[model samples]
Target: MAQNITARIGEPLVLKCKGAPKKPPQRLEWKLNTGRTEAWKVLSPQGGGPWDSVARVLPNGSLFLPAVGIQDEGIFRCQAMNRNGKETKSNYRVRVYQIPGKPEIVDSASELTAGVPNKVGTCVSEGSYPAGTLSWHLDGKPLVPNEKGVSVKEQTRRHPETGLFTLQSELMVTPARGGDPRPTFSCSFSPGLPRHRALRTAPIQPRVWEPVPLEEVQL
Candidate 1:
């Protein structure tokens, strides 16, 4: 008889069992004994063959599973028997783990105020894991290089140990006008993975103001 078994989380596991040729077993079955039957669910049976579900049985007598999950963690048994009275059995263990969580944006500054002619406005956003990017917009449209009376700058930093990053952005304006509406700023972060989630910052308002003449301005 041949016997071999292997299993892991995220990766498929396989079990093999071989028996003498004497009225080959009419039915095959697979079972689990993880001790905590209520926590785990069995998706397939041995007779269906290992390939039936995440696990598959080969002609040569081998079992296979694909993309295993944490719930799959437990003990597994494979059996093959015929009505004539011949039987074969094999048992093995499977283990699974949980993947890491996605990144998030923690903090951000409120709206800013800018005065007429030569006023500066700034915004900042802080984030975590997989890093993030900061951007500025005017009236829902991105601030472009050719946009008049508007300039934007950005910066990024990462944590040495975790490699998480935070981003910040600044917007400057000159010749400010009372009609100059505040632009909205935002921060976005992601892990860049299929299971990853994105974090976004709320829109920030810009400060508005009028610059007084230098000579007439009081200290």
Candidate 2:
């Protein structure tokens, strides 16, 4: 299996090379495939030391990165060479995650057909790493998304500068509507961060907008 690791900013990362070479290597090489510029750059050790303001490589071919940063995100490849010219290789995929911010319901929709599934609103959380989960709520309670038309779709984009993920979740309202105006809806975003629960907006009263026919809105 390929090596995969997710480390938070300001955390130490030690990537150990898998499959120890049967014999000592005549030479060991390390290369960094960075997220920035999308290229592999050679990283060498100075006689004095390998540790610096950035990273270090161990004699065993393991790579050590102190307090991971955005520039350190990407694939790290290492090669071990023997006197016979035989070689072994290892790769590590390192990614950083950020604490996500609160999610907001950006779109408002209505004109109900209790029998027809419809898209009610969109929930979005920006600048979050590892992506977040979005759920719908009605009248301050959890709403169930059925498999049919009542679906919640997720989309994400990574910020170029921050290398963080932004989550966009679209909530498809179920085939049930409020007999009265009591069925308010809201969207919540959860990053699964410890000591932090999902952030949500106050319930919003279902509003009939667009002035479009129910058929058009459904369409």
Candidate 3:
């Protein structure tokens, strides 16, 4: 008897079978529906001896296809045969899924005046995969909560049928001190599943300087 097997892309898969002849098989072969074939290379049961096997196998009867891709999805068959004229066979199906695509930046704003406090600037990044975080940075450094006049907000909405997520992040900068120039701002988006981040910087104009007043008396 053979058990039905199912697996996701990039995941490990295993197949098990029992009721074998005392001498077991001399060779094992595997064939894929993709018209590709591979010969079984034994990893365990060292030396020429009776196949005294254990019931439990940790990836023992398993086939590892690392980073399974769409091309790997197909029917796979395994066969065990001996020189004495005994053979057994089993088959299973594999399914693979596509990886998420890169995120897209839809809209962004920057270069807001420093004099006005409580001003909000928004940046929206649209893409699949709903899990992401929005953050603000200045001069390539992350902003801390205690930093005055800095706030961040994140929102997400899902598509009805596709089941994809679009994310938006808004940053608000309060008025800075009279001596402070306009601070450089950026909205960074990072996906939760993988450690990937996309940063978009806002164009900020340098603050204009006021002319100095001077009085002089000539003799």
Candidate 4:
């Protein structure tokens, strides 16, 4: 029998080899279709040599990976043999998905002057399997470009080797005296599915410039 497994990248994964309770398997071995040359590689038991250092088989015949990666994605077959020469095979299809780390707001403005465009902040999410979505929020509301002098810009970068993606979203705004004197700014990153909730950064506040008050002149 075969089962599908969806694993998060960089997380530990375990492949169980089912053995009958009545008669424990005399021999247990794991085979992997690593997709290198269309041939299965014996990962465990080592044919009496040495076991794999990274992906080692546990005492219970379960294969374990400390941290699953893209290269670890493939079909795994677990073979169990009994004394009577009866054999059982369990197959597993392992797929890996990467979720970006928590979004971080950087290069935030310390103070914002009224009636002028200000570079509020930039939010970044890195090391995602697929490109991630980034959204800008101002005072708990989504920001809209050219609306109330709000602007949003985004950039998606991918690593050549690993093919992982990174996302950056920048927010700019111009404050009016009539609007809230101090507004909170934040951003969110969504890698979709599996990860139900999007990662968000702590909101940051910026000081708004104000005109100095003048005392009444004595007449």
Could you tell me every candidate's TM-score relative to the true structure?
0.37, 0.55, 0.44, 0.65
The 10 consecutive residues of candidate 3 with the worst lDDT sum are: 47-56
Runs with alpha carbons beyond 4 Å of true place in candidate 2 = 18-27, 46-53, 58-61, 81-88, 104-124, 130-133, 139-160, 165-180, 190-219
Off by over 4 Å in 4: 6-11, 19-29, 34-40, 47-52, 79-87, 97-102, 111-118, 128-131, 144-150, 160-165, 174-177, 191-197, 207-219
- What TM value does model 1 have? 0.37
Give Cα-based local distance difference scores for all models. Answer: 0.49, 0.68, 0.49, 0.78
Quote the lDDT for 43 in model 1: 28
Which is better, 1 or 2, measured by lDDT? 2
Off by over 4 Å in 1: 1-129, 181-198, 212-219
Let me know the TM-score candidate 2 reaches against the reference structure.
Answer: 0.55
Q: lDDT by residue for model 3 over 57-80, one digit each (tens)?
A: 222333345344444556666655
Tell me the tens digit of each residue's lDDT in model 2 across 1-219. 558777887788877655434334436667888755666777543311435546776555566787787788888887766444677788888877677767778776745445566677788887766666788877777777765556887788888776778888787764533345445888887774333578886566665332234454543
List the candidate numbers ranked by TM-score, top first.
4, 2, 3, 1
Output the worst ten-in-a-row residue range by lDDT, candidate 4. 45-54
Q: lDDT (0-100) at residue 206 of candidate 4?
A: 91
**Prediction 3 global C-alpha lDDT:** 0.49
Model 1: per-residue lDDT, tens digit, 35-151? 345653342333344343455554444555666644455677766664446887777765443223322223333433344333234344443433434445555666663477766
Residue 203 of model 3, lDDT score:
42
- Best-performing candidate as measured by TM-score: 4
Better of 1 and 2 by TM-score: 2
> What residue pairs are clashing in model 3?
117-175
